Amino acid sequence: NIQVVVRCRPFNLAERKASAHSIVECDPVRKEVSVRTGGLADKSSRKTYTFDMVFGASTKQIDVYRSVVCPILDEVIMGYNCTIFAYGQTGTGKTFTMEGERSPNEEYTWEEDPLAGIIPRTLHQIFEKLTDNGTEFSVKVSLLEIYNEELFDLLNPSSDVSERLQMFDDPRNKRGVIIKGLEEITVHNKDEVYQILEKGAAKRTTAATLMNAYSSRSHSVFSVTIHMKETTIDGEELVKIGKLNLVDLAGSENNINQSLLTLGRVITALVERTPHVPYRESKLTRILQDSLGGRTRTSIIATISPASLNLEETLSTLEYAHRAKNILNK
Numbered sequence: 542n543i544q545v546v547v548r549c550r551p552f553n554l555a556e557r558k559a560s561a562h563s564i565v566e567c568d569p570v571r572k573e574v575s576v577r578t579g580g581l582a583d584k585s586s587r588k589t590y591t592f593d594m595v596f597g598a599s600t601k602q603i604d605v606y607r608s609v610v611c612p613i614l615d616e617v618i619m620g621y622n623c624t625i626f627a628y629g630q631t632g633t634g635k636t637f638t639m640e641g642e643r644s645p646n647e648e649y650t651w652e653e654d655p656l657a658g659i660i661p662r663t664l665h666q667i668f669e670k671l672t673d674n675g676t677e678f679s680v681k682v683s684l685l686e687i688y689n690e691e692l693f694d695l696l697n698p699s700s701d702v703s704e705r706l707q708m709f710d711d712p713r714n715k716r717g718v719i720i721k722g723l724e725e726i727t728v729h730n731k732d733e734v735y736q737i738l739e740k741g742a743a744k745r746t747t748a749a750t751l752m753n754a755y756s757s758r759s760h761s762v763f764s765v766t767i768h769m770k771e772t773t774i775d776g777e778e779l780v781k782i783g784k785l786n787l788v789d790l791a792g793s794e795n796n797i798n799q800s801l802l803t804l805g806r807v808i809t810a811l812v813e814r815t816p817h818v819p820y821r822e823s824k825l826t827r828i829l830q831d832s833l834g835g836r837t838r839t840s841i842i843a844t845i846s847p848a849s850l851n852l853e854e855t856l857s858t859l860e861y862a863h864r865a866k867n868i869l870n871k
């Protein structure tokens with residue numbers, strides 16, 4: 542059930558000018574990825590894997606958004622809960638896929654930037670798809686990040702990062718938590734998206750100075766909750782509630798990341814049909830417990846490098862991502 546797509550990234554300038562030979566190959570139509578585990582391009586040993594979708598270095602943001610995100614957003618907009626994770630080693634494109642970047646030289650507007658990733662495209666699309674149509678709706682976002690088993694709010698402008706939040710269990714709905722003091726910001730219009738992300742980015746900078754390897758070691762959860770009162774062309778009024786969580790995981794490479802470790806152990810228990818699934822063992826899996834063998838529609842985007850130096854890590858990531866194909870939820 543859980544859908545797992547692989548995204549390979551392009552070689553950088555340091556790799557192009559250093560004449561880099563991709564040890565990776567992608568077959569979208571065959572949904573397959575091949576990794577040369579040794580030897581030459583003349584003759585070689587290769588390892589093959591089959592996923593739910595595969596995107597090669599040539600894949601653009603728009604490609605990923607139309608192919609994977611738009612269908613998930615329609616489900617959220619149907620009153621569903623969905624979650625998408627970006628998993629992979631540092632330098633492979635987790636943040637790039639989830640948030641994207643800006644085109645150089647102030648070339649574009651944030652709505653047009655071909656470099657924009659999932660989070661920005663998604664927030665812009667919600668206001669598109671709903672505004673036109675006859676829908677009443679509010680949009681709330683929160684940005685909850687985990688570093689060394691502590692919780693931070695990257696959107697609260699009244700508090701500074703160093704203030705960690707407390708998490709408790711939800712006495713109402715089992716298998717869910719309440720995070721005390723976490724800000725939920727209302728996005729009044731599309732021209733409110735940008736400044737929200739501007740503020741999160743800003744705070745991220747301070748978090749980064751307060752904590753070592755922050756961008757590499759933290760897990761970030763950006764959630765958009767949609768409240769809709771849709772009045773069909775007829776006159777019916779459907780009240781729906783959707784939540785999409787977008788998770789940029791800490792680098793997969795290997796102190797200890799308890800949330801990463803637990804995540805991997807939760808997948809193992811799920812796919813090996815073990816009675817005990819160790820959710821409670823980390824903040825992340827407690828937060829996102831419903832996304833793992835829960836009533837949530839989840840997708841994993843595994844990001845790999847094409848360079849030869851990263852073979853062991855890309856192998857490790859493919860292997861990890863293949864296994865999660867066997868987790869049944871919803």
Ligand SMILES: CN1CC[C@H](N(C)C(=O)N2CC(c3cc(F)ccc3F)=C[C@@]2(CO)c2ccccc2)[C@H](F)C1
Binds near residue numbers: 657660661741743
């Ligand atoms: C000086 N400032 C100029 C603007 C800058 N900025 C806001 C951004 O460009 N973004 C932050 C972001 C994002 C930030 C979060 F906290 C959480 C989630 C997210 F998706 C996405 C992108 C960058 O890839 C983006 C790329 C494309 C379109 C919009 C935004 C930043 F403020 C520096």
Ligand SMILES: Nc1ncnc2c1ncn2[C@@H]1O[C@H](COP(=O)(O)OP(=O)(O)O)[C@@H](O)[C@H]1O
Binds near residue numbers: 549631638
């Ligand atoms: N699919 C991609 N296309 C183009 N550049 C990419 C892609 N994936 C990653 N990159 C680049 O690789 C670098 C590290 O990427 P980043 O998104 O920060 O990854 P991570 O969050 O996994 O550590 C950045 O320079 C980003 O420009």
Ligand SMILES: [Mg+2]
Binds near residue numbers: 635636637756789
């Ligand atoms: Mg990152």
